[PDB]
Amino acid sequence: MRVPFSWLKAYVPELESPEVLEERLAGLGFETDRIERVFPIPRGVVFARVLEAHPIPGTRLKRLVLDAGRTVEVVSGAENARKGIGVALALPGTELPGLGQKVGERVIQGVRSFGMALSPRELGVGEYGGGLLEFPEDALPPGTPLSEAWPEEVVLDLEVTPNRPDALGLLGLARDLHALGYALVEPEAALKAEALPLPFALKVEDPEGAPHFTLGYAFGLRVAPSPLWMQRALFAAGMRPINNVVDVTNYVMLERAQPMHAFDLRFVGEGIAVRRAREGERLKTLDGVERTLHPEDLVIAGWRGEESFPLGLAGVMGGAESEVREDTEAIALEVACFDPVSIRKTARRHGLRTEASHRFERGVDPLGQVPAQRRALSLLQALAGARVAEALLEAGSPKPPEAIPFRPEYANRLLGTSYPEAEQIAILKRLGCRVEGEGPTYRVTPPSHRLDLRLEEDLVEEVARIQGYETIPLALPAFFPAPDNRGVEAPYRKEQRLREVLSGLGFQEVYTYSFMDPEDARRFRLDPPRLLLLNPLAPEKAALRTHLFPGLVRVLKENLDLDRPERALLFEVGRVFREREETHLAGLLFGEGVGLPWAKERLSGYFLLKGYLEALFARLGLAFRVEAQAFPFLHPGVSGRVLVEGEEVGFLGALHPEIAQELELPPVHLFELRLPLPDKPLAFQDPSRHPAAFRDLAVVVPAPTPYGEVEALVREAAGPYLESLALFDLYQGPPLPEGHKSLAFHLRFRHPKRTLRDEEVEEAVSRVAEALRARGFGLRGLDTP
Amino acid sequence: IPLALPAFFPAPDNRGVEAPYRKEQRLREVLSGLGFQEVYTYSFMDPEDARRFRLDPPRLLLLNPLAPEKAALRTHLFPGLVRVLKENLDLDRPERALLFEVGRVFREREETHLAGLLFGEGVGLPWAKERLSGYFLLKGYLEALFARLGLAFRVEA
Amino acid sequence: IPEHHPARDMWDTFWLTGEGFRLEGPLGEEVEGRLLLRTHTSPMQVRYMVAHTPPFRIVVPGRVFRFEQTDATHEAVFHQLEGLVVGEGIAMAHLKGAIYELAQALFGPDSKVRFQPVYFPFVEPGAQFAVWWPEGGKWLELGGAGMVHPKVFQAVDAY
Amino acid sequence: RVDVSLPGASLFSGGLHPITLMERELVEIFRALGYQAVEGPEVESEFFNFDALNIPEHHPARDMWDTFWLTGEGFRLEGPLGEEVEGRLLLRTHTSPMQVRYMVAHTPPFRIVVPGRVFRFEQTDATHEAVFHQLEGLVVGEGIAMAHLKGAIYELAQALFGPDSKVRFQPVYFPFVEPGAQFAVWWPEGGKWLELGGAGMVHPKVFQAVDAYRERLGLPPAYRGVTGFAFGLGVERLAMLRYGIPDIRYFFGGRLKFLEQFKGVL
Numbered sequence A: 001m002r003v004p005f006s007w008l009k010a011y012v013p014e015l016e017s018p019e020v021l022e023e024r025l026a027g028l029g030f031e032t033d034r035i036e037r038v039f040p041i042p043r044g045v046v047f048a049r050v051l052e053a054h055p056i057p058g059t060r061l062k063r064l065v066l067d068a069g070r071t072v073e074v075v076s077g078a079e080n081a082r083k084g085i086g087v088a089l090a091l092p093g094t095e096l097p098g099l100g101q102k103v104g105e106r107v108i109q110g111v112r113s114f115g116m117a118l119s120p121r122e123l124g125v126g127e128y129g130g131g132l133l134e135f136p137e138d139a140l141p142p143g144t145p146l147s148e149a150w151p152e153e154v155v156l157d158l159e160v161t162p163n164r165p166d167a168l169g170l171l172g173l174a175r176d177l178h179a180l181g182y183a184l185v186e187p188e189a190a191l192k193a194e195a196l197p198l199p200f201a202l203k204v205e206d207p208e209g210a211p212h213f214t215l216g217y218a219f220g221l222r223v224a225p226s227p228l229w230m231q232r233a234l235f236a237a238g239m240r241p242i243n244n245v246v247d248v249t250n251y252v253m254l255e256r257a258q259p260m261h262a263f264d265l266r267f268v269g270e271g272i273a274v275r276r277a278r279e280g281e282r283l284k285t286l287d288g289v290e291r292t293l294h295p296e297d298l299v300i301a302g303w304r305g306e307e308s309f310p311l312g313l314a315g316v317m318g319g320a321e322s323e324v325r326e327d328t329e330a331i332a333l334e335v336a337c338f339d340p341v342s343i344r345k346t347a348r349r350h351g352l353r354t355e356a357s358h359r360f361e362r363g364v365d366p367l368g369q370v371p372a373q374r375r376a377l378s379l380l381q382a383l384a385g386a387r388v389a390e391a392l393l394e395a396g397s398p399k400p401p402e403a404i405p406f407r408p409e410y411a412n413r414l415l416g417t418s419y420p421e422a423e424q425i426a427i428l429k430r431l432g433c434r435v436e437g438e439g440p441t442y443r444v445t446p447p448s449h450r451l452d453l454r455l456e457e458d459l460v461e462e463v464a465r466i467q468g469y470e471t472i473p474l475a476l477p478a479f480f481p482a483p484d485n486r487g488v489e490a491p492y493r494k495e496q497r498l499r500e501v502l503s504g505l506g507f508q509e510v511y512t513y514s515f516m517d518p519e520d521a522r523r524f525r526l527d528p529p530r531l532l533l534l535n536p537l538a539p540e541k542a543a544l545r546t547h548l549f550p551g552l553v554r555v556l557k558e559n560l561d562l563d564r565p566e567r568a569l570l571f572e573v574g575r576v577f578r579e580r581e582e583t584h585l586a587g588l589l590f591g592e593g594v595g596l597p598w599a600k601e602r603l604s605g606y607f608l609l610k611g612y613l614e615a616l617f618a619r620l621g622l623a624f625r626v627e628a629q630a631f632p633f634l635h636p637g638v639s640g641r642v643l644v645e646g647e648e649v650g651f652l653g654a655l656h657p658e659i660a661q662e663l664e665l666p667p668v669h670l671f672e673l674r675l676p677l678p679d680k681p682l683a684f685q686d687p688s689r690h691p692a693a694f695r696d697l698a699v700v701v702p703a704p705t706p707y708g709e710v711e712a713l714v715r716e717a718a719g720p721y722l723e724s725l726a727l728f729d730l731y732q733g734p735p736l737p738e739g740h741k742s743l744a745f746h747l748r749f750r751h752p753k754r755t756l757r758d759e760e761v762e763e764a765v766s767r768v769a770e771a772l773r774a775r776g777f778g779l780r781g782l783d784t785p
Numbered sequence B: 001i002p003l004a005l006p007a008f009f010p011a012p013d014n015r016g017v018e019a020p021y022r023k024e025q026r027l028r029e030v031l032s033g034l035g036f037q038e039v040y041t042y043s044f045m046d047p048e049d050a051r052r053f054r055l056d057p058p059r060l061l062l063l064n065p066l067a068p069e070k071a072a073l074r075t076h077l078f079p080g081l082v083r084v085l086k087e088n089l090d091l092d093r094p095e096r097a098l099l100f101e102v103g104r105v106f107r108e109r110e111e112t113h114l115a116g117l118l119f120g121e122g123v124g125l126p127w128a129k130e131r132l133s134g135y136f137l138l139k140g141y142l143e144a145l146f147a148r149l150g151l152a153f154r155v156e157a
Numbered sequence C: 001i002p003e004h005h006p007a008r009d010m011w012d013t014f015w016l017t018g019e020g021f022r023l024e025g026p027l028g029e030e031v032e033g034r035l036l037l038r039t040h041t042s043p044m045q046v047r048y049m050v051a052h053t054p055p056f057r058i059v060v061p062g063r064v065f066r067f068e069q070t071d072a073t074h075e076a077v078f079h080q081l082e083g084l085v086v087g088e089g090i091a092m093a094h095l096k097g098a099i100y101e102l103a104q105a106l107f108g109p110d111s112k113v114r115f116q117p118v119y120f121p122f123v124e125p126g127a128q129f130a131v132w133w134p135e136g137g138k139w140l141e142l143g144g145a146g147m148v149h150p151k152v153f154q155a156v157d158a159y
Numbered sequence D: 001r002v003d004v005s006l007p008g009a010s011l012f013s014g015g016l017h018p019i020t021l022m023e024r025e026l027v028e029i030f031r032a033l034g035y036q037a038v039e040g041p042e043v044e045s046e047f048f049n050f051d052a053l054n055i056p057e058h059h060p061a062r063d064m065w066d067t068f069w070l071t072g073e074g075f076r077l078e079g080p081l082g083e084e085v086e087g088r089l090l091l092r093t094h095t096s097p098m099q100v101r102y103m104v105a106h107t108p109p110f111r112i113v114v115p116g117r118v119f120r121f122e123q124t125d126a127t128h129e130a131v132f133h134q135l136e137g138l139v140v141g142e143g144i145a146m147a148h149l150k151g152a153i154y155e156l157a158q159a160l161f162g163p164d165s166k167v168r169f170q171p172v173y174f175p176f177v178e179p180g181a182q183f184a185v186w187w188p189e190g191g192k193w194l195e196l197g198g199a200g201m202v203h204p205k206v207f208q209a210v211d212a213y214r215e216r217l218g219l220p221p222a223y224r225g226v227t228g229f230a231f232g233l234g235v236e237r238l239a240m241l242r243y244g245i246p247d248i249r250y251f252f253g254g255r256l257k258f259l260e261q262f263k264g265v266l
């Protein structure tokens, strides 16, 4: 909201300056996005009176005869240029913002234009450039520098949060400054009304949408340009003056957050009807836009005989037809309170956001209409020489606000402050609250304009901000937390350790958007995503990821196109969505591998990843096994599931060749698990002091049989005294029955209490050869040294 | 006597006072994550090892040692690491071993050292035979450590 | 934060769809309601409170989502850190103390904090806070805060 | 095709020492309470290890610490402010001297915790070491009371043994505190009281020693109008009970079969 310093100053006369005002509004809860000086007007620009307008034959231009101290002549093409108005004359030699081309005397279509009349845009007061500024013909003595009646202004760009709709009115802001201690000057609406009937009726057919609706009656109007002070005020606030009546309604709206509209009675007919719009019903709004109304749109309509017609889109924008113009003599003034939700939907429905809708959506003083009617009618009387009727047409009777219990002791207790009770009461009073009782708990009933004051807490914020948030001392709380709050951070801590170990093991963390491209369910061969977005950022991000690896594969690609990494060991931890929201851990391996930079031999692919992973779980103290299993997105020959501590928690393998190809990618290896990982408690095993028995033996097995099954068998039967068991050599070929292979196992036995008898070891290996063959496996070596 | 907890804003000169301790802790944790096994060794030293391990003599000695084997204060961290390698090879027969220890050393001034030990066949496929080991395996792990720590690591002759 | 409440606009929401999804409440129950991507970590303070008892101090980091246009200083996917301290006698003086400590811890002894009233449907008083960054010589608007709103505690105990 | 159940590259997997784990947990427990961890030197001056802590020579109280006395020229022992400190050198018999060093170097209020290697001339058995670790605590400031010390230890217990844990305090003697106390924590699983450590309100003479050394260094007094509590607890005893380690001697044994058993432990 634009806050023109000198305008606000009219309500708060003692304001020190815009800078101090910015400070004061900040502590009140309003942040200024920017301060700006706005109306520099050179001395060359003077006030002039248009004595006569003479169209130049053969052109669409006019020769203006201006009284500017001395009679001067200027040529204009502005449609509004006409006799009887005052204008902004830029004398030859003037430096104008808009043009940057020094103004001069020049010949246009046969006449010497001694300078030129200005539009808001040329003078630099507004963006409007389609017509001349129109001033009262007597605003100033002809020829006086406009500066002298139009001084520069400083405007603050104020943020007005949804809770302070009363602040959408300059007087609302004034009251806050008042609570701080500044003197307040409320405009007195001096009205000289006359008792007589209003020549029209009011019929509110939809009280839901128009809870409180009033109509003022002003006639004998003399529509003309607004005084300079008003045009200056309106322009500073971002609005464009139009004329007497229209400006007055905009001025009051900006003054007290109360949108209002003057309807020319010529079009009202018998009366105003606040009703819902009938389907199809058309309306040419003020913006010149021809619209089609929806049955949910609240409408301000008129009726004549057996006909009802729309006059304006209620609380959003008046109709173009009944707009008040120069020939208007009488109006019906609309000052109402509309249902916020209705205004909200209508506004969206038609793509409109106006000074009016904005205020009605945020809320209007439920009992501010009548006072607003007097302010406006008073101004109309003063500026449009309006005769005003004593009575109003009113429908609806809102109830005043209720009392709120308030305890100075609680305010101080909640804030941690010690403001003396009297200061608290006084503040609430300065904000217009009524305070009753004598404590310790008072009856505080707020002003109707404060929709944000309903609870005691609300009142304590009032005391706090008027006292100043900086007066609240600093402190630290001390307490023994309730029992059920213990160890509550274990889960979070667990995952953090995991990430840290990964980064230390050699993995590079990566963050990827939670979004997924529905089409990738296809590309990466994955079941379709369960959750989809109703309002995606793009179709590429229309779903919620189900896996972590697809994104990891895509970043591998993007990293290969921007830079050309030779290798890459990545990891990412993230939330996945399928049936339930769950946390996954995915890793990606890629590149030549590990080895000597100058040499050539290297470790890579599947077994490099299975290597790092074995370390991870060794580091984590958890059992890690990888059995063979097929996965749509994995190479059938390089694919297996992961078994941490005995339970299936994910997979590991090479990215399917077909997938790799469609993505133009070299072989890629990866895995994905579900968190939190199984947890294995410590079971310290005191190490035996005595020596351990060493024994070797190879196992003859068919090439198909997986390593795991063998190792499981060898161990399973190796006995309760087995210490180690490691594969130190895989061999398949002659002299072994082709399609067969031998598994060189390094065994070690040991006994906690004493040393082992060769009888027990021999037996051990024997118990092994037993089932080892019972399964169909040979023994290339036995009792091997 | 009731139970209570104190509340106060600590005096300014007490801020970040824990950075040093935190720094070393991170170091240990990264080492354990990189692949190093932490080890704790007595601060004591055998005066005779100044000879065995070719080290300048210990500056601080004990007036009341537990035994002459522990009559001095260690000046280096590696000698003890080498001795545990030996003891681990006599009790159990580790094939490999990547160790690390952080500890206070004494010479001119008390200072904190970080020592590491590599030993064994190396890294590679258990069933295969090709392997990475020795000097360049250690220089490998160390390059990672400093890459991880974000510090320049060079090794001149 | 009602529907068609002006305050709803302070959060551009990603609304989701799809059957078969199970959203579990604070006590593992099957919760219902229109699904969306959390626009902030705040909902977590409601979940925690139904599941625990005061007094306590929690901090909840988290990925959040807002329907917005991605530029140099704006994201649709970002992170927030929520704080919540509840208990007998907890006052705004303590909130300020917390943030004072945050600043000192983050920018050194020459750092300072600043509080100004601001609006949030879930707090009253409401406030925005900025911390002085001595090096960059400027105030950084860090976050919002305030005293938990009466209606929030009410929602918690009703659930 | 490839056997996926085949062992992968034998990349090494590290681990942390039991004491590092226990110390880390203790340090975390107290960080949550606002304590910061700082360390002191293993080789100390008799002044800091004893005199500054109200422990005279040929004082019966000296016997509560069997000391390793050192010798050798050329050694530089730096005081709290980097200065060149003097006095008979020894291996600190406890972390307590560090609370004197910290106080001369800082100003109250504060909360510190100082873990550290300590040395006592003793015979090494199943539950006794000549080389072990302690965790000292020190909280000083206006209004600090014994009620706060008890609160601290109550929190230590809860954090270590769960909601069904309890603490117990009994008077005991230390030249550096008055009141003095020993505290035990209830361990619900083992169903028994564990004597954890000593503690009390920092002794008047300790604050006096601190401010005298400060003045002797040009610093202004800082502990005239404050009080504080201090505690000290043995780590090995706790680590043992917490990991089920039977022989205190394993810690410095260096046996991998032993150390390796704690890779999982966070």
Ligand SMILES: N[C@@H](Cc1ccc(O)cc1)C(=O)O
Binding pocket: A249, A259, A260, A261, A262, A286, A313, A314, A315, A316, A317, A318, A334, A336, A354, A356, A357
């Ligand atoms: N657009 C209206 C302003 C307004 C809008 C809605 C109202 O209900 C009242 C006034 C006008 O030009 O006057």
Ligand SMILES: N[C@@H](Cc1ccc(O)cc1)C(=O)O
Binding pocket: D093, D094, D095, D096, D136, D174, D176, D177, D197, D198, D199, D200, D229, D230, D231, D232, D233
């Ligand atoms: N320092 C003492 C234990 C202790 C520590 C701090 C105290 O406040 C009291 C006692 C020891 O070595 O046993």
Ligand SMILES: [Mg+2]
Binding pocket: A163, A452, A458, A461, A462, C124
């Ligand atoms: Mg409020």
